[PDB]
RNA sequence: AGCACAGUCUUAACGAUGGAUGUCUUGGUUCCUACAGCGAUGAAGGCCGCAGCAAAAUGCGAUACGCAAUGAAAAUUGCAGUGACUGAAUCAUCAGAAUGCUGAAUGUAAACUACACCAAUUCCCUGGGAAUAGUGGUACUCCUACAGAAA
RNA sequence: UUGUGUUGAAGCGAAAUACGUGAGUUUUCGUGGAACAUCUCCCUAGUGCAGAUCUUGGUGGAAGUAGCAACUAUUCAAAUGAGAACUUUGAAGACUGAAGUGGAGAAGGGUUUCUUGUCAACUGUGAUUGAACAAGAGUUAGCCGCUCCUAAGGGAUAGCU
RNA sequence: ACGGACCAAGGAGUCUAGCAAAUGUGCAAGUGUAUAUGAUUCUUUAAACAUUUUACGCAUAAUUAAUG
RNA sequence: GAUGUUAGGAGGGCAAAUCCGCCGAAUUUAAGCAUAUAAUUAAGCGGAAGAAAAGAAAAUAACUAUGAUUCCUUUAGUAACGGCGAGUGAACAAGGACCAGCUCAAACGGUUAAUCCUUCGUUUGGUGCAAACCUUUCGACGGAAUUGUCGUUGAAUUAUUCCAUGAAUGCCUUUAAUUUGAGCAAAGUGAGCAGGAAUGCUUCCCCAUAGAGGGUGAAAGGCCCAUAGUUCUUUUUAAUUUAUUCAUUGGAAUUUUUCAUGUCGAGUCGUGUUCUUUGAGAUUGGAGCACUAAUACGUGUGAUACAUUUCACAUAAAGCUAAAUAUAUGUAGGAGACCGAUAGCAAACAAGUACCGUGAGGGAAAGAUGAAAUAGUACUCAGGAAUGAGCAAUUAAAUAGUACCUGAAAUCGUUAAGAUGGAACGGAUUAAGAGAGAAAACAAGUAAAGAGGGGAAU
């Protein structure tokens, strides 16, 4: 698996196919799901529409045993 | 993030290196228990190392139809059968002294089988060629000719599960 | 050179006063060897291998007659008593450990897990 | 082979070749025995003794015989009497043959050699 | 694996403002070659693999049930193609068909003498040569690695 | 018997310096398995010693690189030396004996081989006969039993 | 899977009417002295270096160069020795100048002390010298000190936290 | 403009979790036999082999805060 | 109470991987940061075992219901928590491993503490060579305890049936398994080549329930140890051997006839408030403080705060408990698609060593002659000596000479060839020299004689 990694093909062009201007630095947008609402804003809402918000009333302790139910037509 | 993956979730925020662990003796193990409970059948000749359990409903509506081995008979069921609770739990019945036998089905579907065990049951005397006839629903003790003549043939385990 | 087996039957006087030369010769081979006589230096090895030995039988002889003399009596001393380790000392005994109350007992003996076959 | 409480590693078994105690390696140094005595005594091989008869059958003296004169365990090592060989400096000194290149053609009998015998047979 | 905290086991201290030397972690102290030579750090000696292997690599595989069974039904069947058997190394120029079968008599048979024999009866001296004379002592350092001999498939 | 200018640089052959490479490995590493506490009956740790010639490491404790006993059993050696013709040389085992000063360290102390108090003490013969200033004991807290004072 | 090795493997040095476009591959001679491939197909990774004031080790030009400059100062003759400006002896010229490179101690050091050897290294020149190396030896207390007393103060007991 | 006196050896996109896409493979309204059990296999084997005719995941149905 | 160097005892310290209490950060993430996260983590303090801890419901559920604890698969990245941001995050059911239940308190026993401990004794039989150990029941003595030990588990009454009781006589076999330590254990040291030396190459034989490994002067199934196998021996542990007589002493289970519904853990639960903790949200657990209960018809849970009330479940505030589980520690075995001396542990070696720091601490470098030094360099010459040389010498080999296998590059020496006016090197094209070279770079066949090798032909 090793022998068939994409880096093994970029191994002596310097940048390691990172860039040779953007380089590759250690988070630099920020660490997991930083930026929603600010600066990854328009991924959130290009690919993820209704993440942020709370919907509807709680269920406190569910107990999915109560309301299991397979259906067959 | 970038394109379109799944929001991340992972968990893996505090230190988990130490907390991570794989199991490479899960068939070691395997093969341990097997020689353990061998030895312990062998140990105890004849007897079977299984305990006698009670056919019980589970719980929920979710598994509502389907019955599996529960602990311990009721007190009702082995009065029923015919032995108290300290005299079941010396011939391999577990007995249980919270659950309740709330239908008629589930109260004699357990005494029948508590009679099966009991009529396939075959008992060694406790002073060897001394049988006597029991106590508190023991059936009574087999005698020498038959006790040989059972204790080459196959124990049915059937019986157990 | 002597051999501990020989000198196991003497008693403790041929014990101790045969110490007792063998420690003087071993005292004037070290005075050889101090000025610069070094002809018999290797026989040093020899007698001082001897003292161990009646050392040994001796001690022994005194370690066996000090056991006879506290034999029984139930308070020997802490060198005489069971060198066992301390937890081990410390330990329930095994009578204590199964004792049992008169209630459990006539429990056990009138109900004993018993021996049985299954068809 | 089909025992796995003892060992088949290499550098396990080389070091205790290496750093066996001089009781193992007395029988470590066992020899053949000729064929004659051989089926005197229905054995195959005896650890060697330093008044044994010895026919060495390996190495560049692979045809001579002789009472082996000394027994040297450090080195895993026997000496026979007459295969000497001259020092630089120009004094004699036996060459060390390894005992399993030579073959027992007489034993020296023993009280102890006899109770290894006979427990043999 | 190697050892967890490999390389790292040292005073971290990369003094290196200003001192006229690469900014690397140098160890501590003085009175010894250590002092002051570069610490942990996968270009340094005595610092530490890139990424260190650690035990929880994804050893096994599970196969699938049905894949498996496959396999072994079509090596069963490849077994009993002759071309196949003759491609693969095995010498069976002089039997007479390849889905060879013997009377279970076989398996009573208890000398390696007489398996021998009767390997060499049915036609498959050549394979047994073959057999004996592939042992030999592998190359490289896996000999130092309880893997000495390497001998072919009959 | 004579002849090359010198230096600098290039090439080849042979060397020097250096310790790469290859090959080795009584080491490591990882997994699996099993067992699992030692200590006032003085532990772990620390000092100090101990060999014929002996620094370290290893081993051992005034019996001091080892005693006894048990199994094997002829070597052990650098020299000197010691060994049966097998409780003897050397291995292994290791149950007996022995185990310095310390250290929780516990009579008081401590950059003291300093200083107490109480029993004198130890050995040998089968009540005597010797030799020793040596040997034991003495912490704090607590439990059980006892003792004699008290309100 | 199918092969090469003591009639010399790996490695290494120089090479080749050699192949490739190229990474390379393959051969020769030398050296070497014990292992080595597999391109049949496949599996696997701690798998490819010119740099990172990279890490470790080795080695250069600088260069026989900078330098070997405080403390006024040396000389003659002899001895020893393979060898003497810097070892010893005699003679001379001088210095330190009792606020001393003079005698006794403390702290610190720990055998550097002494005698006899003695020169591989060290003694930044030499060295036969030495505080170096080697073998032996040397420290004697009722009166000198410690040990005792108490001080600034420290530790602990009773409690109490 | 910065790094590089020289040479050797070492030296840097990897491992695990989780998701997706792509492609190969098996089976297909199913699929994966999880933990575990058995079994004349117990050098290898810590792997292979097996599973008395509703375990669980995902899928087979969506939608709504929700009674549904 | 105080005091006792009265008698007998215990605690203390080390070690920690797993385990049990406490105390308790910040880096970090949030692209800033303060709640949050890191994390109920690190560090700090204490305490245990071969496991610990948890544990026999004041539990779930809402079902046709389950039934102590722990662990695995799953539930489930789910319900939920959260500047509802980053992030965090359980439980029940289901399938398995393992499987075990119990005792105090309280009730009852006073025609009699029926309990317990200390010390001193007697014999009851056993395996040890001994040392020691296991059994043993008849006391006596001195105490403790009514400010409560022990028995019962409501208590009497029939019936059956079980269980412990002593003495005498006889029997102590036989096998399977399991576990230590020991022995025994196949077949060539056959030609020939070469080599210092086969274990190599040819060739002729074999053994194999042994062709695992190691050693041996080179690669060994047949040279050695050992390996396969097998025989004894140790541990315990199943089944199979035999039990029979004579007797009274107690106990137990269930079933008949009676009486009374008993007991059931208090500064505790609970509530309020504060802080923390939790997924727990008008508060999950814990803790501090204030208040402070009921008595089983009670009181606690039923995941949203209340009032009135049904239903279900459990029976808090005392205690013990094996297994399945974990083990970066120690010790001992065994392994590997691991590393191969700048790697692998820091340490392959006299390594936690040398050495450094006042100290807490920091912490290396360093493996390889050769088959054999039981071959480690003899002799001569020259030198003060170190060394060097040899007509001398060990070795297969000394250019393997102790910094010793191989012995790269940088750097330097010797010899030779060439170039040489303020760089050197280079690209491209040839030329002149100098090294090597015939595998395409001519000659197959034909006739003869000389050495050989093969194939077929009796």
């Not at chain 1, 390691?16 to 609402?37: D, E, S, T, W």
């Not at chain 2, 968990?11 to 228990?33: A, D, E, G, P």
């Not at chain 4, 001259?86 to 102890?112: A, M, Q, R």
């Not at chain 5, 196949?84 to 390849?98: D, F, Q, T």
């Amino acid at each position: 698996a090793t022998r068939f990694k994409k880096n093994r093909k970029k191994r002596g062009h310097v940048s390691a196919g990172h860039g040779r201007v953007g380089k590759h630095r250690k988070h630099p947008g920020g660490r997991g799901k930083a930026g929603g609402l600010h600066h990854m804003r328009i991924n959130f809402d290009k690919y993820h529409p209704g993440y942020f918000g709370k919907v509807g009333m709680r269920h406190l302790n569910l107990l999915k045993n109560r309301t299991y139910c397979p259906t067959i037509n | 993030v970038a394109h379109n993956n799944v929001l991340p979730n992972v968990h893996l925020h505090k230190w988990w290196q130490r907390h991570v662990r794989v199991n490479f003796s899960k068939n070691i193990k395997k093969k341990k228990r097997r020689l353990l409970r061998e030895k312990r059948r062998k140990a105890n000749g004849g007897t079977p190392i299984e305990k006698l359990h009670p056919i019980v409903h589970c719980p929920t509506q979710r598994y509502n139809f389907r019955t599996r081995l529960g602990k311990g008979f009721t007190f009702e069921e082995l009065k029923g059968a015919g032995l108290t609770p300290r005299a079941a739990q010396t011939i391999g019945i577990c007995y249980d002294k919270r659950r309740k036998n709330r239908s008629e089905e589930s109260l004699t579907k357990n005494v029948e089988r508590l009679l099966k065990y009991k009529n396939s049951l075959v008992m060694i005397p406790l002073k060897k060629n001394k049988a006597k006839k029991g106590i508190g629903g023991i059936p009574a003790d087999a005698d020498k000719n038959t006790i040989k003549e059972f204790r080459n043939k196959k124990p049915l385990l059937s019986i157990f599960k | 050179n002597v051999k501990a087996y020989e000198l196991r039957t003497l008693k403790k006087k041929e014990l101790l006063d045969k110490l007792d030369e063998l420690k003087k010769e071993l005292s004037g081979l070290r005075i050889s060897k101090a000025l610069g006589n070094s002809a018999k230096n290797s026989k040093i090895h020899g007698v001082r291998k001897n003292v161990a030995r009646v050392l040994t039988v001796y001690n022994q002889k005194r370690k066996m007659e000090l056991r006879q003399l506290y034999k029984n009596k139930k308070f020997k001393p802490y060198n005489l008593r069971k060198k066992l380790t301390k937890n081990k000392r410390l330990q329930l005994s095994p009578k204590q450990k199964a004792a049992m109350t008169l209630r459990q007992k006539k429990k056990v003996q009138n109900f004993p897990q018993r021996k049985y076959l299954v068809v | 082979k089909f025992n796995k409480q003892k060992s088949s590693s290499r550098r396990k078994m080389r070091k205790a070749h290496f750093t066996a105690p001089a009781g193992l390696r007395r029988k470590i140094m066992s020899s053949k025995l000729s064929k004659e005595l051989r089926l005197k005594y229905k054995t195959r091989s005896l650890p060697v003794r330093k008044d044994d008869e010895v026919l060495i059958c390996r190495g560049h003296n692979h045809g001579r015989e002789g009472k082996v004169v000394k027994i040297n365990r450090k080195r895993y090592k026997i000496y026979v009497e007459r295969v000497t060989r001259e020092k630089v400096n120009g004094e004699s000194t036996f060459i060390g043959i390894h005992p399993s290149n030579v073959v027992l053609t007489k034993l020296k009998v023993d009280k102890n050699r006899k109770k290894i015998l006979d427990r043999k047979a | 694996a190697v050892k967890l905290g490999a390389g790292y086991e040292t005073s971290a201290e990369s003094w290196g403002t200003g001192r006229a030397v690469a900014r690397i972690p140098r160890v501590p102290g003085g009175g010894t070659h250590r002092a002051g030579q570069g610490a942990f750090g996968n270009m340094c000696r005595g610092g530490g693999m890139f990424n260190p292997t650690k035990i929880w690599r994804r050893w096994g595989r599970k196969v699938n049930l049905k894949e498996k069974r496959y396999a072994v039904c079509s090596s069963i069947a490849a077994s009993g193609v002759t071309s196949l058997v003759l491609a693969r190394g095995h010498r069976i120029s002089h039997l007479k068909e390849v889905p060879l079968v013997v009377s279970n008599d076989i398996e009573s048979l208890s000398k390696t003498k007489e398996a021998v024999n009767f390997l060499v009866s049915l036609g498959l001296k050549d394979e047994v040569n073959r057999l004996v004379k592939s042992k030999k002592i592998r190359a490289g350092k896996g000999k130092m690695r309880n893997r000495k001999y390497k001998i072919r498939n009959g």
